[PDB]
Amino acid sequence: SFSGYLKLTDNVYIKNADIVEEAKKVKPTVVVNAANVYLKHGGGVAGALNKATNNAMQVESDDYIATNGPLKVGGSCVLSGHNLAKHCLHVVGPNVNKGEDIQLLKSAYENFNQHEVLLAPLLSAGIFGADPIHSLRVCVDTVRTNVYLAVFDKNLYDKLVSSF
Ligand SMILES: O=C(O)[C@@H](Nc1ncnc2[nH]ccc12)c1ccc2c(c1)OCCO2
Known part of the structure; x- marks a missing residue:
């Protein structure tokens, strides 16, 4: 159901699009959130996805944290996709603006291998401070x-x- 994507490799596709608007259109099985360890969806992709769920994502995430404690950097958890997707895979990439280790980015991407198809942002890019060209590689x-x-x-x- 995805459309207007440019093929980069056998399994990787890219598009200039708002992940919230893409999610509402495709309603994919999995949408990936660029989360932090506390699942506090304040800004960037996380704040945009949360606002599109009318804060339902934040309410669900605070219950998850109250029960399980925080995620590891490079880790993930599967929660509801609410009105955007069947599931939301909350993945924690290293935040360079917080001194976190960029080497953990590969561990962050390995989480995607547990799902057949995903709609996703570039991990650790944007307000997370990593080089987006390195993140795509x-x-x-x-x-x-x-x-x-x-x-x-x-x-x-x-x-x-x-530059690909
Ligand atoms: O367009 C993007 O998808 C990307 N923006 C940029 N990523 C790097 N240098 C940038 N320079 C100008 C925009 C920009 C992004 C913006 C928020 C994001 C995000 C990724 O992923 C994780 C946290 O939220």
Whole structure:
């Protein structure tokens, strides 16, 4: 059901799109959230997905944290997709602006291999402070399942495609 994606490899596809608008259109089985260890969906992709669920994602996430404690950096948990998807795979990539180890990004992408097809952002890019070109390279070299990447920024999308 995905459309207008550019094929990068056998299993990796990319599109200049708002992941919230893409999610409401496709209603995929899994939408990936660029989460932090506490599942506090304040800004970036996480704040945009949470706002699209009318804060239902935050309420569900606080109950998950109250029961299980925080995630590890490089880890993940599967929660409801609410009105956007069947499931939301909350993945924690290293936040360079918090001094976290960029080496954990490959461990972060390995979480995608547990799902046949996913709609996702570039992990650790944006407000997480990592080089998006490096994030796309780690993605293509780590994920074996079908991943459809949504890149919000037009200028960044062009840079990623032209330098791939
Ligand atoms: O367009 C994007 O998808 C991307 N923006 C940028 N990623 C890097 N340098 C950038 N320069 C200008 C925009 C930009 C992004 C924005 C928020 C994000 C995110 C990724 O993933 C994790 C947390 O929230």
